[PDB]
Design a protein around this ligand. Structure first.
Ligand SMILES: *C[C@@H](S)[C@@H](Cc1ccccc1)C(=O)O
Ligand SMILES: [Zn+2]
Length: 303
Protein backbone atom coordinates (compact mmCIF):
# COMPACT_ATOMS: atom_id res chain seq x y z
CA UNK A 1 0.00 0.00 0.00
CA UNK A 2 1.03 3.67 0.00
CA UNK A 3 1.40 3.20 3.77
CA UNK A 4 4.04 0.47 3.40
CA UNK A 5 5.76 2.24 0.47
CA UNK A 6 9.35 3.39 1.05
CA UNK A 7 9.47 7.13 0.29
CA UNK A 8 13.16 7.32 1.29
CA UNK A 9 14.52 5.25 -1.59
CA UNK A 10 14.64 5.53 -5.39
CA UNK A 11 12.16 3.46 -7.39
CA UNK A 12 11.70 1.87 -10.80
CA UNK A 13 9.05 2.86 -13.35
CA UNK A 14 6.85 -0.11 -12.44
CA UNK A 15 7.07 0.67 -8.71
CA UNK A 16 5.97 4.28 -9.33
CA UNK A 17 3.10 3.24 -11.61
CA UNK A 18 2.03 0.67 -8.98
CA UNK A 19 2.14 3.45 -6.36
CA UNK A 20 -0.33 5.48 -8.46
CA UNK A 21 -2.76 2.56 -8.56
CA UNK A 22 -2.46 2.02 -4.80
CA UNK A 23 -3.14 5.70 -4.07
CA UNK A 24 -6.20 5.77 -6.35
CA UNK A 25 -7.55 2.57 -4.72
CA UNK A 26 -7.08 4.08 -1.23
CA UNK A 27 -8.48 7.55 -2.03
CA UNK A 28 -11.15 7.18 -4.74
CA UNK A 29 -12.98 10.39 -3.72
CA UNK A 30 -9.85 12.53 -4.19
CA UNK A 31 -7.46 10.95 -6.73
CA UNK A 32 -7.92 9.54 -10.23
CA UNK A 33 -5.41 8.29 -12.80
CA UNK A 34 -5.58 9.74 -16.31
CA UNK A 35 -3.76 8.47 -19.38
CA UNK A 36 -2.86 11.47 -21.55
CA UNK A 37 -0.90 9.63 -24.25
CA UNK A 38 1.71 6.98 -24.99
CA UNK A 39 5.48 7.45 -25.00
CA UNK A 40 7.52 6.90 -28.17
CA UNK A 41 8.18 3.28 -27.12
CA UNK A 42 4.51 2.73 -26.18
CA UNK A 43 4.45 3.14 -22.41
CA UNK A 44 1.40 4.83 -20.90
CA UNK A 45 1.79 8.48 -19.84
CA UNK A 46 -0.05 8.99 -16.55
CA UNK A 47 -1.31 12.09 -14.75
CA UNK A 48 -2.81 12.01 -11.25
CA UNK A 49 -5.84 14.30 -10.89
CA UNK A 50 -6.48 15.57 -7.36
CA UNK A 51 -9.97 17.07 -7.08
CA UNK A 52 -12.76 17.54 -4.55
CA UNK A 53 -15.36 18.11 -7.29
CA UNK A 54 -16.65 20.92 -9.51
CA UNK A 55 -16.40 20.92 -13.29
CA UNK A 56 -13.39 22.31 -15.15
CA UNK A 57 -12.11 23.95 -11.95
CA UNK A 58 -9.12 26.31 -12.17
CA UNK A 59 -6.09 24.03 -12.11
CA UNK A 60 -2.43 23.68 -11.18
CA UNK A 61 -0.17 21.67 -13.54
CA UNK A 62 2.94 20.03 -12.03
CA UNK A 63 5.32 17.86 -14.07
CA UNK A 64 8.43 16.00 -12.89
CA UNK A 65 11.01 13.80 -14.63
CA UNK A 66 10.94 15.39 -18.10
CA UNK A 67 14.72 14.78 -17.96
CA UNK A 68 15.00 11.16 -16.91
CA UNK A 69 18.32 11.24 -15.00
CA UNK A 70 16.97 13.84 -12.53
CA UNK A 71 15.87 11.09 -10.12
CA UNK A 72 15.22 13.40 -7.16
CA UNK A 73 12.28 14.79 -9.17
CA UNK A 74 10.28 11.57 -9.69
CA UNK A 75 10.96 10.71 -6.02
CA UNK A 76 9.70 14.13 -4.92
CA UNK A 77 6.62 13.64 -7.13
CA UNK A 78 5.68 10.39 -5.36
CA UNK A 79 6.08 12.13 -1.99
CA UNK A 80 3.91 15.08 -3.16
CA UNK A 81 1.13 12.70 -4.23
CA UNK A 82 0.98 11.03 -0.82
CA UNK A 83 1.27 14.40 0.98
CA UNK A 84 -1.74 15.82 -0.91
CA UNK A 85 -3.91 12.93 0.37
CA UNK A 86 -2.64 13.35 3.95
CA UNK A 87 -3.11 17.11 4.14
CA UNK A 88 -6.51 17.57 2.52
CA UNK A 89 -8.92 18.10 5.44
CA UNK A 90 -6.02 18.59 7.89
CA UNK A 91 -3.90 21.55 6.76
CA UNK A 92 -6.07 24.70 6.50
CA UNK A 93 -4.14 26.24 3.57
CA UNK A 94 -3.95 23.10 1.41
CA UNK A 95 -7.60 22.32 2.18
CA UNK A 96 -8.54 25.78 0.85
CA UNK A 97 -6.51 25.15 -2.33
CA UNK A 98 -8.11 21.78 -3.18
CA UNK A 99 -11.58 23.11 -2.25
CA UNK A 100 -11.21 25.69 -5.06
CA UNK A 101 -8.74 24.14 -7.52
CA UNK A 102 -7.68 20.85 -9.07
CA UNK A 103 -4.06 19.65 -9.17
CA UNK A 104 -2.71 17.61 -12.08
CA UNK A 105 0.53 15.83 -11.21
CA UNK A 106 2.69 14.07 -13.82
CA UNK A 107 5.35 12.16 -11.86
CA UNK A 108 7.19 10.55 -14.81
CA UNK A 109 7.00 12.91 -17.79
CA UNK A 110 9.56 10.88 -19.80
CA UNK A 111 8.92 7.19 -19.02
CA UNK A 112 11.11 5.78 -21.82
CA UNK A 113 14.09 7.77 -20.58
CA UNK A 114 13.32 6.75 -16.99
CA UNK A 115 13.28 3.06 -17.87
CA UNK A 116 16.58 3.57 -19.75
CA UNK A 117 18.21 5.17 -16.68
CA UNK A 118 17.51 1.93 -14.79
CA UNK A 119 18.36 -0.57 -17.55
CA UNK A 120 21.28 1.00 -19.48
CA UNK A 121 22.43 4.55 -18.76
CA UNK A 122 21.91 6.29 -15.42
CA UNK A 123 22.60 9.71 -16.97
CA UNK A 124 20.18 9.57 -19.90
CA UNK A 125 18.41 12.95 -20.37
CA UNK A 126 16.43 12.85 -23.62
CA UNK A 127 13.42 10.97 -24.97
CA UNK A 128 14.07 7.73 -26.90
CA UNK A 129 12.64 8.70 -30.31
CA UNK A 130 14.43 7.27 -33.36
CA UNK A 131 16.05 9.98 -35.48
CA UNK A 132 16.02 9.47 -39.26
CA UNK A 133 19.47 9.07 -40.86
CA UNK A 134 21.24 9.23 -37.48
CA UNK A 135 23.08 6.82 -35.20
CA UNK A 136 21.73 8.80 -32.25
CA UNK A 137 18.50 8.55 -30.31
CA UNK A 138 16.25 11.02 -28.49
CA UNK A 139 15.20 14.65 -28.24
CA UNK A 140 15.60 17.08 -25.32
CA UNK A 141 11.93 17.34 -24.31
CA UNK A 142 12.67 20.69 -22.63
CA UNK A 143 13.87 22.18 -25.95
CA UNK A 144 10.84 20.89 -27.92
CA UNK A 145 8.13 23.45 -26.95
CA UNK A 146 6.79 26.17 -29.26
CA UNK A 147 8.53 29.13 -27.64
CA UNK A 148 11.57 30.44 -29.49
CA UNK A 149 11.85 26.93 -30.95
CA UNK A 150 15.15 26.29 -32.74
CA UNK A 151 16.82 29.50 -31.53
CA UNK A 152 20.09 29.81 -29.58
CA UNK A 153 19.93 27.70 -26.42
CA UNK A 154 19.23 24.39 -28.21
CA UNK A 155 20.91 22.17 -30.83
CA UNK A 156 20.00 20.92 -34.32
CA UNK A 157 22.53 18.07 -33.94
CA UNK A 158 20.72 14.75 -33.27
CA UNK A 159 23.56 13.50 -31.02
CA UNK A 160 23.42 16.59 -28.77
CA UNK A 161 22.02 16.42 -25.23
CA UNK A 162 19.99 19.55 -26.13
CA UNK A 163 18.76 18.38 -29.55
CA UNK A 164 15.43 20.18 -30.19
CA UNK A 165 13.93 17.67 -32.67
CA UNK A 166 12.68 18.40 -36.18
CA UNK A 167 9.80 20.73 -35.20
CA UNK A 168 8.07 22.03 -32.06
CA UNK A 169 5.95 19.36 -30.32
CA UNK A 170 7.57 16.56 -32.36
CA UNK A 171 7.86 14.49 -29.18
CA UNK A 172 4.67 12.70 -28.15
CA UNK A 173 5.65 13.25 -24.48
CA UNK A 174 5.42 17.00 -25.11
CA UNK A 175 2.44 17.02 -27.49
CA UNK A 176 0.45 14.97 -24.96
CA UNK A 177 0.87 17.72 -22.34
CA UNK A 178 0.18 20.53 -24.80
CA UNK A 179 -3.07 18.86 -25.92
CA UNK A 180 -4.21 18.15 -22.35
CA UNK A 181 -3.54 21.69 -21.09
CA UNK A 182 -5.08 23.41 -24.14
CA UNK A 183 -8.17 21.18 -24.16
CA UNK A 184 -8.65 21.78 -20.42
CA UNK A 185 -8.41 25.55 -20.93
CA UNK A 186 -8.45 26.51 -17.24
CA UNK A 187 -4.88 26.03 -15.99
CA UNK A 188 -3.74 28.92 -13.76
CA UNK A 189 -0.26 27.65 -12.87
CA UNK A 190 2.28 25.49 -14.72
CA UNK A 191 5.16 24.13 -12.64
CA UNK A 192 7.94 22.00 -14.11
CA UNK A 193 10.35 20.27 -11.73
CA UNK A 194 13.99 19.54 -12.60
CA UNK A 195 17.30 19.06 -10.83
CA UNK A 196 19.87 20.29 -10.01
CA UNK A 197 21.20 23.73 -8.94
CA UNK A 198 18.77 25.07 -6.26
CA UNK A 199 17.04 27.66 -8.44
CA UNK A 200 13.48 28.87 -8.95
CA UNK A 201 13.04 30.15 -12.49
CA UNK A 202 10.44 32.15 -14.36
CA UNK A 203 10.37 33.12 -18.10
CA UNK A 204 12.11 33.72 -20.37
CA UNK A 205 14.92 31.40 -21.42
CA UNK A 206 14.91 32.21 -25.14
CA UNK A 207 15.16 36.02 -24.86
CA UNK A 208 16.60 38.67 -22.53
CA UNK A 209 13.30 40.59 -22.85
CA UNK A 210 11.61 40.75 -19.43
CA UNK A 211 8.10 39.35 -19.04
CA UNK A 212 5.34 41.91 -18.48
CA UNK A 213 4.50 40.20 -15.14
CA UNK A 214 8.11 40.32 -13.91
CA UNK A 215 7.50 42.24 -10.68
CA UNK A 216 4.78 39.83 -9.53
CA UNK A 217 6.44 36.57 -10.60
CA UNK A 218 9.74 37.72 -9.08
CA UNK A 219 7.98 38.41 -5.75
CA UNK A 220 6.14 35.07 -5.91
CA UNK A 221 9.47 33.30 -6.54
CA UNK A 222 11.15 35.21 -3.70
CA UNK A 223 8.34 34.19 -1.31
CA UNK A 224 8.49 30.55 -2.45
CA UNK A 225 12.26 30.25 -1.96
CA UNK A 226 11.99 31.89 1.49
CA UNK A 227 9.34 29.34 2.48
CA UNK A 228 11.57 26.54 1.15
CA UNK A 229 14.63 27.89 3.01
CA UNK A 230 12.68 28.22 6.27
CA UNK A 231 12.67 24.44 6.86
CA UNK A 232 16.34 23.38 6.72
CA UNK A 233 18.16 26.51 5.52
CA UNK A 234 18.62 25.36 1.91
CA UNK A 235 19.60 28.37 -0.19
CA UNK A 236 18.03 28.99 -3.60
CA UNK A 237 18.62 31.66 -6.24
CA UNK A 238 15.69 32.94 -8.33
CA UNK A 239 15.14 34.94 -11.52
CA UNK A 240 14.46 34.47 -15.21
CA UNK A 241 15.84 31.35 -16.90
CA UNK A 242 18.24 33.34 -19.09
CA UNK A 243 19.70 35.47 -16.24
CA UNK A 244 19.81 32.73 -13.61
CA UNK A 245 20.84 29.46 -15.32
CA UNK A 246 21.50 29.97 -19.08
CA UNK A 247 19.90 30.80 -22.42
CA UNK A 248 17.61 27.93 -23.42
CA UNK A 249 15.08 27.83 -26.27
CA UNK A 250 11.87 25.79 -26.59
CA UNK A 251 11.49 25.48 -22.80
CA UNK A 252 8.12 24.52 -21.38
CA UNK A 253 7.40 27.49 -19.07
CA UNK A 254 8.15 29.94 -21.89
CA UNK A 255 5.43 28.16 -23.89
CA UNK A 256 2.97 28.02 -20.97
CA UNK A 257 3.45 31.69 -20.09
CA UNK A 258 2.97 32.74 -23.73
CA UNK A 259 -0.25 30.70 -23.83
CA UNK A 260 -1.56 32.82 -20.93
CA UNK A 261 -0.63 30.77 -17.86
CA UNK A 262 0.76 33.56 -15.68
CA UNK A 263 2.19 31.48 -12.83
CA UNK A 264 4.74 29.52 -14.86
CA UNK A 265 7.84 28.38 -12.95
CA UNK A 266 10.61 25.78 -13.15
CA UNK A 267 12.31 24.42 -10.02
CA UNK A 268 15.90 23.17 -9.98
CA UNK A 269 16.11 20.96 -6.87
CA UNK A 270 19.10 19.91 -4.70
CA UNK A 271 22.03 20.02 -4.79
CA UNK A 272 24.39 22.58 -6.39
CA UNK A 273 26.81 19.99 -7.79
CA UNK A 274 28.45 18.12 -4.91
CA UNK A 275 26.49 14.97 -5.82
CA UNK A 276 24.52 16.44 -8.75
CA UNK A 277 22.24 13.93 -10.50
CA UNK A 278 23.41 11.23 -8.07
CA UNK A 279 21.89 12.92 -5.02
CA UNK A 280 21.62 10.22 -2.36
CA UNK A 281 18.32 8.63 -1.35
CA UNK A 282 18.96 9.93 2.16
CA UNK A 283 18.11 13.41 0.84
CA UNK A 284 14.79 12.51 -0.85
CA UNK A 285 12.51 13.25 2.09
CA UNK A 286 14.10 16.54 3.23
CA UNK A 287 14.25 17.74 -0.42
CA UNK A 288 10.57 16.87 -0.91
CA UNK A 289 9.54 18.49 2.40
CA UNK A 290 11.21 21.84 1.72
CA UNK A 291 10.19 21.89 -1.97
CA UNK A 292 6.58 21.30 -0.91
CA UNK A 293 6.65 24.54 1.10
CA UNK A 294 7.81 26.41 -2.03
CA UNK A 295 5.17 24.80 -4.24
CA UNK A 296 2.39 25.41 -1.70
CA UNK A 297 3.44 29.10 -1.55
CA UNK A 298 3.02 29.40 -5.34
CA UNK A 299 -0.39 27.69 -5.13
CA UNK A 300 -1.49 30.12 -2.40
CA UNK A 301 -0.68 33.03 -4.73
CA UNK A 302 -2.68 31.34 -7.51
CA UNK A 303 -5.86 30.76 -5.47
C1 LIG B 1 17.53 21.95 -15.08
C2 LIG B 1 17.97 22.26 -16.47
S1 LIG B 1 18.26 20.59 -17.12
C3 LIG B 1 16.89 22.99 -17.30
C4 LIG B 1 16.89 24.54 -17.09
C5 LIG B 1 15.70 25.19 -17.81
C6 LIG B 1 15.76 25.47 -19.17
C7 LIG B 1 14.67 26.04 -19.85
C8 LIG B 1 13.50 26.30 -19.13
C9 LIG B 1 13.43 26.02 -17.76
C10 LIG B 1 14.52 25.47 -17.10
C11 LIG B 1 17.05 22.68 -18.81
O1 LIG B 1 18.18 22.90 -19.31
O2 LIG B 1 16.06 22.24 -19.43
ZN1 LIG C 1 16.48 19.20 -16.57
Amino acid sequence: STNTFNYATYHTLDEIYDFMDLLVAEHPQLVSKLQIGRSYEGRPIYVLKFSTGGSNRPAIWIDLGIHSREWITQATGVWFAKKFTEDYGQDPSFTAILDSMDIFLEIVTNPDGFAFTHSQNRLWRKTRSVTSSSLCVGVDANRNWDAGFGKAGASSSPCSETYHGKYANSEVEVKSIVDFVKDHGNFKAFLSIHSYSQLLLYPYGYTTQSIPDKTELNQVAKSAVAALKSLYGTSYKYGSIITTIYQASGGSIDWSYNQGIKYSFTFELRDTGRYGFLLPASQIIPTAQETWLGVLTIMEHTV
